[PDB]
Amino acid sequence: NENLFASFIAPTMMGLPIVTLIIMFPSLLFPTPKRLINNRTISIQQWLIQLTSKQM
Amino acid sequence: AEFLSLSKARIEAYEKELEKMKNIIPFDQMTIEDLNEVFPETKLDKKKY
């Protein structure tokens, strides 16, 4: 009888706030450049697609 | 007469082919359309791989 765990009883809530903002928001994390050489933060997004476009 | 001029246009078109290659890039980070003359683009569903 050394280490007694505890618990807390509380409702676990998957509520539904305003969704159509939250859906659009991980689009603006990815930009798209109209340039030949890019700016070393799109350039590791642009490489990550090249990989898994060559397996599907 | 003809063969020195038919090679001269082949010298003249080759003199224009390199000078257009200097037109495409003014810098390493230059342009996404000026590099779209030598390296090609096409219509829908050309590049298989």
For residue B17, give both structure tokens: 């082919």
User: Tokens 């050394």 appear where?
Assistant: A2
Residues sharing a CB contact under 8 Å with residue A46, sequence separation 6 or more, in sequence order: A38
Our CA angle for A48, A25, A41, nearest 5°, is 35
**Contact: B31, A34; criterion CB under 8 Å:** no
Rounded to whole angstroms, the Cα distance separating B15 from B8 reads: 10
* Inter-chain CB proximity B29 and A35 less than 8 Å: yes
Which residues, 6+ apart, have CB-to-CB distance to A42 below 8 Å? A30, A31, A32, A33
B21, B26, B23, B22: which is closest to A37 by C-alpha? B26
Q: Give ∠ CA B10-B35-A41 in degrees, rounded to 5.
A: 160
Dist. CA A4–CA A1, nearest whole Å: 7
Resolution, Å (one decimal): 3.3
Helix (H, G, I), strand (E, B) or coil at A9: coil
Beta strands in chain A (DSSP E): none
